[PDB]
Amino acid sequence: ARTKQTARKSTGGKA
Amino acid sequence: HMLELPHEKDKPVAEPIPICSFCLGTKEQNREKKPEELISCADCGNSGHPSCLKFSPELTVRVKALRWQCIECKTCSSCRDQGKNADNMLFCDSCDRGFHMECCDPPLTRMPKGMWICQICRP
Ligand SMILES: [Zn+2]
Ligand SMILES: [Zn+2]
Ligand SMILES: [Zn+2]
Ligand SMILES: [Zn+2]
């Protein structure tokens, strides 16, 4: 897929 | 020969934050405690190691040449908004720009399954 939601999940959240 | 958008030009660039939002370390230490230069959002200054961002080396190179938006700042390269479906905003695997499915040319209604590259990057 790769969306903004998946990008969050894939990288572990921002700080 | 990478294409830049008119609205991505002559715009203010935020002061880069010298720490990764994901691993909380500098350009001198990634998750492997190895050197890796950061990629920084031109809107808010947020930075991340390409490794922490899960960028391929190819995507890393192209993104560094562009006005990049962090995951939170990313707006649709077509309509310039985040909108109601911002979570579903597609990210280009070639340039990491954002596109709503309905803002793509031609429009999409369902999520592409594998790698996806935008209308700008498509040959
Ligand atoms: Zn990092
Ligand atoms: Zn940002
Ligand atoms: Zn849009
Ligand atoms: Zn693209």
Residue numbers in the entry:
A (entry chain C): 1 to 15
B (entry chain A): 190 to 312
Source paper text:
The developmental regulator monocytic leukaemia zinc finger protein (MOZ) also known as (MYST3/KAT6A) is a MYST (Moz, Ybf, Sas, TIP60) family acetyltransferase that is required for self-renewal and differentiation of haematopoietic stem cells. In addition to the MOZ acetyltransferase domain (referred to as the MYST domain), the N-terminus of MOZ contains two tandem PHD fingers comprising the double PHD finger (DPF) domain. The structure of MOZ DPF shows the typical globular domain of a DPF with PHD1 and PHD2 each harbouring two zinc atoms coordinated by C4-H-C3 motifs in cross-brace topology. The structures combined with biochemical studies reveal how MOZ DPF manipulates the structure of the H3 tail to sample its modification status and promote its acetylation.
To investigate the impact of H3K14ac on the helical structure of the H3 tail, we crystallized a MOZ DPF–H3K14ac complex. The structure revealed that the helical conformation of H3K4-T11 is preserved and the majority of interactions in this region of H3 are unaltered. However, the interface area (844.6 Å2) is increased in comparison with the DPF-H3 structure (695 Å2), revealing the molecular basis for H3K14ac recognition by MOZ. Importantly, a conformational change mediated through H3G12-G13 allows the acetylated H3K14 side chain, now devoid of charge, to insert into a preformed pocket on the DPF surface. This pocket (lined by S210, F211, N235, L242, W257, C259 and I260) is mainly hydrophobic and exhibits a weak positive electrostatic potential, rendering it unfavourable for unmodified K14 interaction. The acetyl group of H3K14ac forms a hydrogen bond with the main chain amine of I260, revealing that I260 makes contacts with both H3K14ac and H3K4. While H3A15 engages in a hydrophobic contact with L213, residues C-terminal to this are not visible in the electron density, indicating that they are not involved in interactions with the DPF domain. While MOZ-DPF showed enhanced binding to the H3K14ac peptide as compared with unmodified H3 tail, this enhanced interaction was not observed using the GG12/13AA peptide, which bound the DPF to a similar level as unmodified H3. This result highlights the importance of the GG hinge to enable engagement of the H3K14Ac by MOZ. The predominantly helical H3 conformations seen in complex with MOZ DPF reported in this study are at present unique. This more compact conformation, in conjunction with a GG hinge, allows MOZ DPF to engage at least the first 15 residues of the K14 acetylated H3 tail.
